[PDB]
DNA sequence: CACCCTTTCATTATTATTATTATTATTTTTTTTTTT
DNA sequence: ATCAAGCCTTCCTTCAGGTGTTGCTCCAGAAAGGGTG
């Protein structure tokens, strides 16, 4: 490795190319579309390339959800050019315990722990937390994550730190203190989501840099849904309802809503029952309540709500209404499916910039469809080719058996498809994750499966996330039975089913021992600018994302090297029928053999 | 250069395609025979290789401009806004051979075989106009290479690589125009109406028993032709967003800025057809140079070495390079 | 040293082909005489014998660009973007002999046999572009093949045996494009407009009764000079359709693979099948697999540096004196 | 000298054509995240 | 606080047989001679 980058000696042989090809045309200005599989090592591919990019005197930014940022910080630790330059991390207020009130509930539950680590300043317990503290060299008190191990049953929403808390707690001070954290360090790193508010509080004119000389997104896919998120303002109806009695034109505002299975989807104004005179109420009652007297934590609700009204006050915004899955709560959203103008702004303040994920191509090096979810400039973009290695289908099992019906909903598939999960299971030694699409094809198949499974299924439904029933898979695989999951939502994308029990040796590696596709994952993404995008491109975005879905639902099995004897089988009839729309689903199918 | 513009149609677009099309009343185009079928003049059509579904790769119908025609196009711009006046500000002229090679690339038909010199080509080829449109006697190869106008399409979407996946159309993208075509003498109504017609009334009367007679002669044959002629064609709808690409292997700076001198009045000109129902009237929405936007609303602001290019040939310009491009080796 | 080269055309491509073709003013081709017929030059099409639909071969249709337009394109653009500037910079010159054999390959040079030593013919090709093009007097095997574009379709299926089912184009391939020259002398009608002849009115108005009376002659032989109104058809092979391309070299040297990794880098300014003023024959590479394996991206050819530094040596080595001593002795 | 240019010869004598055929219309219901 | 909680037939008719121009052009040969630098 002659005139090497900067912590390439820990990154894998086989990116070592796409490595130099990155840093070559991130140095050029380009933003580049890097893709990686799971395994091959991308952290320290990152620190790689954030390393080479700080030493040349650039303000380097990486973007990555904050499971991903403390194996990123760890990968760039302990290399000595960004021992040099410095790492810092940006937080936003969601971060942070609020400390008076996580104390008046330690006493009302009784937590001893919890109350004797806030009598104290709240001082980092976790590894975590301190090793944190000491690369960053501020000292991270009051987090969320030191809370929960403490007591993993407290009400978060209900101690998480909101703007409107007083300016003499401590978490407050270390939060705004902590603001200007990328002043101090030439590496920042941050999540999507604090990057995608950074870009409409550009737009709006601190918390990052007004120019990211070279910019890293780990993790890529997940970026344009960020800021699909942070321009949605949603009005929680019963929340305020009951804050309130703690008005009657935001009842007939609800009444009104009533009356406009989509309901009122991607339509900004065209209908207009009595909704903007119950807006225009609805901000004069709520706004001109008084605040003296309003509780530090109802003026927060009161304040997201106000803002949910006058985003939908404008018109410049799309309008949804949505249901909770406890119960049949009103829910508002004005959200946005037109996302050109921010991120033209973010890419206008980046010099150069990385596109990395597992999942960035469609076919190929085709990266125009993510260009297209992100707003990339094309005289900008540069889609690198891709790395798919062998042994990433190597251990995979593939079998030829599948059920005959196709899914419709019907009863008869749910009986033909348990029939072939029970010979899966049967077949099984380990533990199994079927993959449904649907709610309603899960509960199907949990009403054709519980009775003869026994305590074997698990079931993942709107009483049950998809982090307990990794919990409890995780649980039932540590007590020797071998788990069957009916799994769904983020069950397809972005679950470790590797087992850290067992780190040095993965050819004894048995958490996932078969996976099942019950039906090609077809019409996953609703989002307001993915209905778009459909709407403009057709039906080749719908299947596009569809295969995107399932070469993620795919990328469950075998998450390193080493592994052996892994099942994968797919029960869509329309896999072994003749139809053409279902060809782009043959050929990550015709990439393993027997 | 590799020029890329993109224009909008603000009116429609009808380059004609030839052959004999027909149409019912409903709007089926080239309905079964025995049917009452009008005849329709449908716009120039090429099929193109296209991505419906997903890999199930298919020519379908996409509506163009040919090359051919706007290349001719780009052609008379710069001749009629560029070439012509300043060849005629000065005392310089042409002959109607050399006007007809600076137009329709040859003088005549018959072309000479015999080749023409190796001092003359590189001459003709440095020229701004001639080494772009390289017709003469003796066939020079120009160094301008049009496009087909395409349409930001999503059937043009393996046509154009990427950047144009937003403000890029679906769907059918044409529609039928109907014709009358009144006869005008059944339209008058008065003595005050006919006092213009020679004769007055007995001419008209006259001209009405001859289109009754020869409706009884389409009677007949049914079971010489009338000004009554009831037909349709079909255009482009007005508004789509068209791509359009210049090539030049190796200009000169000025030839290249003959080209953006034309884009330059390209505005207030007529892509297609249909003159008299104003059809290919458009605007440049966008002028990329290597891929450079280089086009304001102003005009161009860009390309200032080859806008002082051609300003320099332009001065330099006269009748002697095109009347040795005109003139036939056996004539 | 296979290299399978498939691209996408953004343009038409048309090949023209031999033969007084025929249409109506409809699609129907080569009518019976005795109805009004146009000229028509289609674009380049063979039979092929392709095991389509059934378990026989059969005689269909495949229009393509012939390989011997393929091996000037290549040779061209190796010509212009590699030989050209490297050749420019050093400051060497070709002669009669040196150029046709170079750009033609042609024996024009000298033309009668030349008896060439084994030493030559070795260190010839040894040489990059004298390995790829031998030929011309010395008569020099070549080391580059080229395969003809073969369109990924039905009818070139079984040339494409495998791995190239997905992406296959079917039924029609080709379409006529018509085009009219007509006269400009026809488009006049302003006194501004006529101002610019040398003549003027007068000149314009002998082209018309020059125009008349040869209308006159010819409807009256009907029952040699020609105007300039002209409507003509061209059948063109539709655009986006992905071709296939074989480059196979006979065992090469180092250098010659570079230099045709160079030209596919480069190419992408250059065109196929002529139809220049159309602007036909537009592409853009789609991928690159050097013995099967992809080394294709979108701005050149990632991979394959042992090549690029052997060409790279080679372009600097290169010299007009081994052009002459394989034109001239 | 090598190269570069201009003009001689022949008299053939019908002329089938690929009759292939050419412009569309398919899904479907998630429940994330950890920002102001 | 409730009933009566719309009835019947209207449900197209001529005109529109499009016609003119375009209906291809070049070249694909090497001698041997004479006037040049």
Redesign the pocket.
């Known amino acids: 490795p002659a005139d090497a980058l900067p912590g390439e000696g820990a990154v894998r042989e086989v990116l070592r190319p796409l490595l130099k090809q990155a840093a070559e045309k991130t140095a050029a200005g380009k933003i580049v579309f890097a893709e990686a599989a799971t395994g091959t090592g991308k952290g320290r591919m990152i620190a790689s390339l954030a390393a080479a990019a700080a030493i040349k005197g650039d303000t380097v930014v990486v973007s990555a959800?904050?499971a991903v940022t403390w194996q990123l910080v760890n990968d760039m630790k302990d290399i000595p050019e960004v021992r040099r330059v410095g790492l810092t991390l940006s937080?936003?207020?969601?971060?942070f315990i609020s400390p008076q009130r996580t104390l008046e509930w330690a006493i009302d539950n009784e937590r001893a722990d919890l109350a004797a680590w806030i009598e104290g300043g709240g001082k980092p317990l976790s590894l975590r937390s301190m090793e944190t503290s000491k690369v960053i060299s501020h000292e991270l008190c009051w987090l969320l994550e030191d809370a929960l191990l403490l007591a993993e049953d407290l009400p978060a929403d209900s101690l998480?730190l909101t703007?409107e808390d007083p300016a003499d707690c401590p978490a407050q001070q270390l939060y705004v203190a902590m603001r200007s954290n990328y002043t101090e360090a030439g590496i920042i790193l941050c999540?999507?989501?604090?990057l995608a508010?950074h870009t409409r509080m550009m737009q709006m004119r601190l918390?990052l840099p007004h120019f990211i000389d070279t910019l890293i997104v780990d993790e890529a896919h997940l970026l344009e849904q960020a800021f699909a998120?942070?321009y949605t303002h949603t009005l929680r109806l019963r929340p305020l309802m009951r804050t309130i009695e703690g008005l009657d034109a935001l009842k007939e505002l609800f009444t009104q809503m009533q009356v406009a299975?989509?309901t009122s989807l991607n339509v900004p104004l065209s209908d207009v029952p009595e909704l903007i005179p119950a807006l225009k109420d609805t901000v004069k009652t709520l706004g001109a309540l008084p605040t003296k007297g309003m509780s530090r934590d109802a003026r927060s609700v009161i304040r997201?709500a106000t803002?949910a009204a006058n985003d939908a006050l404008s018109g410049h915004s799309r309008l949804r209404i949505?249901?909770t899955?406890v119960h049949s709560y009103p829910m508002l959203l004005s959200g946005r499916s037109n996302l050109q103008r921010a991120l033209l702004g973010l890419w206008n303040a980046t010099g150069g910039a990385t596109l990395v994920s597992a999942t960035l191509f469609t076919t190929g090096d085709n990266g125009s469809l993510t260009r297209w979810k992100l707003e990339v400039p094309t005289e900008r973009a540069a889609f690198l080719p891709p790395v798919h290695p062998a042994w990433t289908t190597a251990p995979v099992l593939l079998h030829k058996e599948f059920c005959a019906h196709e899914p419709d909903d019907s009863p008869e598939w749910a009986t033909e498809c348990a029939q072939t999960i029970q010979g899966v299971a049967s077949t099984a030694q380990g533990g199994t994750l079927v993959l449904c699409?649907?709610?309603?094809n899960t509960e199907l198949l949990a009403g054709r499966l519980g009775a003869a499974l026994g305590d074997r299924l698990i079931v993942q439904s709107?009483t049950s996330?998809?982090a307990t029933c990794l919990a409890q898979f995780k649980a039932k695989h540590k007590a020797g039975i071998r788990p069957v999951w009916l799994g769904?939502?983020?069950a397809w994308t972005?679950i470790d089913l590797s087992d850290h029990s067992l780190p040095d040796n993965p050819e004894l590696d048995r958490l996932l021992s078969d996976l099942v596709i019950t039906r090609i994952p077809?019409?996953?993404?609703?989002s307001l600018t993915h209905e778009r995008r459909?709407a403009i491109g057709?039906?080749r975005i719908?299947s596009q994302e569809a295969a995107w879905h399932f070469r993620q639902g795919l990328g469950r099995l075998v998450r390193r090297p080493g592994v052996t004897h892994k099942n994968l089988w797919v029960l869509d009839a329309r896999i072994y029928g003749g139809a053409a729309?279902v060809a782009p689903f043959r050929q990550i199918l015709d990439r393993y053999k027997k | 250069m590799q020029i890329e513009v993109t224009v909008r149609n603000i009116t429609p677009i009808f380059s004609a395609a030839p052959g004999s099309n027909y149409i019912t009343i409903d709007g089926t185009?080239?309905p079964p025979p025995g049917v009452?079928?009008?005849?329709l003049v449908r716009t120039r059509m090429m099929?193109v290789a296209a991505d419906?579904?997903d890999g199930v790769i298919k020519?379908?119908?996409l509506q163009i401009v040919p090359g051919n025609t706007m290349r001719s196009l780009l052609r008379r711009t710069m001749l009629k806004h560029v070439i012509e006046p300043a060849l005629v500000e000065k005392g310089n002229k042409l002959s109607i051979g050399a006007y007809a090679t600076a137009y329709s690339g040859n003088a005549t038909?018959?072309?000479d075989?015999?080749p023409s010199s190796f001092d003359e080509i590189a001459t003709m080829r440095a020229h701004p106009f001639i080494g772009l449109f390289g017709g003469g006697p003796r066939?020079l190869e120009g160094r301008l290479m049009v496009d087909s106008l395409y349409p930001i399409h999503t059937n043009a979407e393996r046509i154009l690589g990427a950047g144009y996946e937003n403000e890029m159309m679906s769907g059918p993208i044409t529609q039928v125009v109907w014709?009358?075509?009144m006869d005008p003498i059944l339209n008058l109504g008065s003595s005050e109406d006919v006092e213009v017609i020679n004769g007055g009334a007995v001419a008209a009367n006259g001209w009405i028993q001859d289109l009754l007679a020869?409706?009884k002669?389409?009677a007949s044959?049914?079971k010489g032709?009338?000004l009554?002629?009831?037909?349709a064609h079909e255009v482009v709808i007005p508004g789509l967003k068209w791509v359009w690409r210049i090539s030049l292997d190796r200009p000169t700076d000025a030839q290249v800025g003959l080209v953006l001198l034309a884009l330059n009045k390209m505005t207030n000109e007529r892509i297609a057809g249909g003159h008299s129902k104003d059809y290919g009237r458009f605007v440049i929405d966008g002028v990329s140079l290597n891929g450079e936007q280089v086009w304001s609303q102003s005009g161009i602001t860009g390309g200032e070495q080859y806008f002082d290019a051609v300003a320099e040939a332009i001065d330099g310009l006269s009748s002697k390079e095109f009347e040795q491009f005109a003139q036939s080796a056996k004539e």
Do not use: C
Not at chain 1, 437 to 440: A, I, L
Not at chain 1, 522 to 526: L, T
């Open positions: 959800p904050l937080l936003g207020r969601p971060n998480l703007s999540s999507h989501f604090m508010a918390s998120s942070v299975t989509n997201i803002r949505e249901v899955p699409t649907s709610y309603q709107k996330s998809a769904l939502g983020a972005g077809v019409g996953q993404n609703r459909t057709g039906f719908i729309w | 185009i080239n009452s079928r009008f005849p099929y419906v579904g020519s379908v119908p038909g018959n072309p075989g015999v066939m014709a009358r075509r020869n409706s002669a389409a044959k049914k032709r009338g009554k002629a009831f037909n």
